[PDB]
């Protein structure tokens, strides 16, 4: 989409795509930067 999208989806644990994350409010939060295309729909 632009320079380098930022992965910020939430999960139940650091995802293989977001080795860096944080568990808050019970879910997770991604703080990585990647953009191999427009997006993952």
């Amino acid at each position: 989409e632009e320079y380098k999208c930022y992965c910020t989806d939430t999960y139940s644990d650091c995802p293989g795509f977001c080795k860096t994350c944080k568990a808050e409010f019970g879910k997770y939060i991604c703080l990585d930067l990647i953009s191999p295309n427009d997006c993952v729909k």
Partner: peptide, 11 residues
């Protein structure tokens, strides 16, 4: 396949 919540408000 990365994440479904990709942040990119600025194509």
């Amino acid at each position: 396949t990365a994440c479904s919540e990709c942040v990119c408000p600025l194509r």
